[PDB]
Amino acid sequence: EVKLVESEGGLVQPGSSMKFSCTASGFTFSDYYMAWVRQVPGKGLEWVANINYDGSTPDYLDSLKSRFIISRDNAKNILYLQMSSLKSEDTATYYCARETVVGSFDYWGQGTTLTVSSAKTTAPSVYPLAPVGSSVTLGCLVKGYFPEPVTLTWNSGSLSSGVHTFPAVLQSDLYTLSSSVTVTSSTWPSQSITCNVAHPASSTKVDKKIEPR
Amino acid sequence: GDIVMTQSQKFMSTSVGDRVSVTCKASQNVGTNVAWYQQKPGQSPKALIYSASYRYSGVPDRFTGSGSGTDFTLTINNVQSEDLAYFCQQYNSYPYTFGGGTKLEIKRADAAPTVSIFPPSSEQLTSGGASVVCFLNNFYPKDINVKWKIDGSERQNGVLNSWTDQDSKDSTYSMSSTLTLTKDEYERHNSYTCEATHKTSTSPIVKSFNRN
Amino acid sequence: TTDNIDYFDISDESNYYLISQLRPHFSNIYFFDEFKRYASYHTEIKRYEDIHKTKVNSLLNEASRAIGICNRAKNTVKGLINILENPQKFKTQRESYDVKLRQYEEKKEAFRGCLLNKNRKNLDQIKKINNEIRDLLEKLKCSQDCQTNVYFDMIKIYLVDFKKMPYENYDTFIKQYKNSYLSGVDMIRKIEKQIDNPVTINAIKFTQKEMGYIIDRFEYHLQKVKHSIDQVTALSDGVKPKQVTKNRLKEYYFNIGNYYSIFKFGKDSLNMLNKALIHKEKIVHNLLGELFGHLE
């Protein structure tokens, strides 16, 4: 019904800059305050800034009034958040949110990850996990990527139920993750099962299929 | 500059049939200017209630809001496995501020883990690169111990583990344990063993692999 | 020759609202101006400044522009009025006066329909802002200890503003206008005995029938202007609680804002209808002087 879609996120070195955008559809953009909210993964929410109807008066969190600029384009229905002189503390997932007359957030985008780091973007290595009962368990090991996150999917969403995707563990500036899937022994390997991984930071996608060993 | 919303309880124990109240404390009087959000695993937050009490359209009536002044409460009737986190927000004055969030910790019958061990891939061996993965899946209660054995001898060196949050469907827990070696190091041993110890059994669940 | 036909109004299908050709076309816009003054005394609803600067004016421009869309429809009716009111220019084409009358009401109701329909989304915005206003009043921290100083303060200002407009002059004028107008209606009916030819008396009866529409328009606004005066004074002479509930203070602000906005609206229309009734009185009498010359 109401859609807030934020631009692609990215990884940035301290001191550099990144501008996010957010395209709005399904409502009159010019009828609402719009805002940005950021959340460090696994942590609470933090309001960053907001903008009024015509964009005449933006307001910010005091700590960020210096480095953060919020802007709107009512003709194109897009909200912008320009950041400068970024630091590691600024690493978060940033949400595009439509603000209520009172100060509520009625609708949220899906968020866009910004990672601030001196570390280098590394594509993940995807290895299959196959064994040597009625149900069978297969796995994927996504190893050696940076930054986070990676999207992991089995058979393009066909396999939704038996999935477990464990949180990544960081060692030496690279992440390692693991995904489980439990499927009926009748279906595997009679029917193939492939493991879809996506690392938006490097714009790479991997689809390794698990074949019996 | 500052208004603080406090959700003193980070985790709250409950059961599926239950009805539970989650509290949020405001540092000053904010009148009714409080809103409540949910955040399920891997999701953007979604609004539920504004004006401490008013439910957005399409929000289930098993969510109720109360409170005025400084003590606000969200009530979640008929708890579900899918439920997790809840954030309060004040919009009385700038800057807007959220509570720390509260997650529901559901209680269920104890479940025994399913243990599966996987040898290193041939792709990783070429890297290389040797990682053995053990999956301890869908167990309850939460805590579990995994023990790695190479050729019958215990090995604590070089093991990284990962735990899932509470599953939104069966309310169980899962855990991944990865044993990483150099390819040469890996190929001087024949048997690699994973051992799960859980309150559900006196004897450990043992899964083994032999390079044949 | 009628040169301006700004006395045509249209009501919605359920009759809650009233569209007018003159700015701001809705009394709802004057309520939004009043509420601007109320927000001044409440810091927690300070965002109404941006609501009023941006959304209310953008509604006013869209109101004026959606009114301008009916411009071609307006002069189409205006072209028919001048044919029917002037016997000499009715003679410049032969169509049955009855047929030309049917065309007039077609084009009229078509024109009035244009006013309503091209303003469907503007009434939607009046409704949105109204709901937007009440949600903002929720941010007042009082719950049952809401102060009525603003409420009774603004009432005092209104009562002074209601003194400025001459109600009695407007009222005295329409009583004489209607009383004489009906006398001309009875006279024409009684006197068509001696008139052999009807086209100039048909022009008289047309102007008199349009004189009836504007009279009723005048009485409607006069009746609603008096209603506003009487009921705000009724609030100023009644019990004056100093504290009240948050929801009843919303009603309070909406009440006086409504009464004052309607008053401002009636003031805008009565001045125009007053002109329109005088102007039609010159056209009628010219045709009466025309009629009597032909009596010989």
Asked if A9 contacts A200 with a C-beta cutoff of 8 angstroms, the reply is yes
Instruction: Give CA separation, A75 vs C57, C121, C187, in Å.
Output: 18, 19, 63
CA distance A66 to A29: 26
Closest CA to C294 of C197, C162, C171: C197
- Cβ neighbours of B114 (radius 10 Å): 19
The chain A residue lying nearest B126, using CA atoms, is: A127
Closest CA to A95 of B39, C180, C26, C36: B39
- Is residue B77 classed as helix, strand or coil in its secondary structure? coil
| Cα radius of gyration (chain C) | 24
Q: How many angstroms separate the CA of residue C59 from the nearest CA in chain A? A: 11
Q: If DSSP states are collapsed to H, E and C, what string results for chain A?
A: CCEEEECCCEEECCCCCEEEEEEEECCCHHHCEEEEEEECCCCCEEEEEEECCCCCCEEECHHHCCCEEEEEECCCCEEEEEECCCCHHHCEEEEEEEECCCCCEEEECCCEEEEECCCCCECCEEEEECCCCCEEEEEEEEEEEECCCCEEEEHHHCECCCEEEEEEEEECCEEEEEEEEEEECCCCCCCCCEEEEEECCCCEEEEEECCCC
Tokens representing C209 are 């029938």
> Is the minimum CB–CB distance between B68 and chain C shorter than 8 Å?
yes
The strand pairing partners of A115, in sequence order, are A11
Tokens representing B104 are 């529901």
Question: Would you identify the CATH topology of the domain A119-213?
Answer: Immunoglobulin-like (2.60.40)
Looking at chain C, the number of H-run helices and the number of E-run strands are 11, 4
CB contact under 8 A, B175 and A166: yes
Interface of A with C in 30-59 (CB under 8 A): 30-31, 52-54, 56-57
CB contact under 8 A, B44 and A111: yes
Q: What are the sequence ranges of the domains in chain A? A: 2-118, 119-213
- Is residue C42 classed as helix, strand or coil in its secondary structure? coil
CB contact under 8 A, A54 and C135: no
- Residue A203 neighbours by CB under 8 Å, 6+ apart: none
> Is the minimum CB–CB distance between B124 and chain A shorter than 8 Å?
yes
What kind and span of H or E run contains C33? helix C27-40
Half-sphere exposure of C258 (CA within 13 A, CB side): 12
Interface of B with C in 145-164 (CB under 8 A): none
Q: How many angstroms separate the CA of residue A48 from the nearest CA in chain B? A: 9
Using a CB-CB cut-off of 8 Å, the residues of chain B touching A137 are 114, 116, 135, 137
Domains and CATH numbers, chain B: 1-108 (2.60.40.10), 109-212 (2.60.40.10)
CB contact under 8 A, A182 and B114: yes
C225 by Cβ neighbours in 10 Å (0-12 / 13-18 / 19+) ranks as: buried
The strand pairing partners of B64, in sequence order, are B75
Q: Which of C54, C128, C138 sits opposite A53 (nearest CB)?
A: C54
- Residue B21 neighbours by CB under 8 Å, 6+ apart: B73, B74, B75, B76
Q: What are the sequence ranges of the domains in chain C? A: 1-296
> Is the minimum CB–CB distance between C46 and chain B shorter than 8 Å?
no
C296 by Cβ neighbours in 10 Å (0-12 / 13-18 / 19+) ranks as: exposed
User: To probe the interface with B, which of A105, A106, A145 has the most B CB atoms within 10 Å?
Assistant: A105
- Cβ neighbours of B194 (radius 10 Å): 25
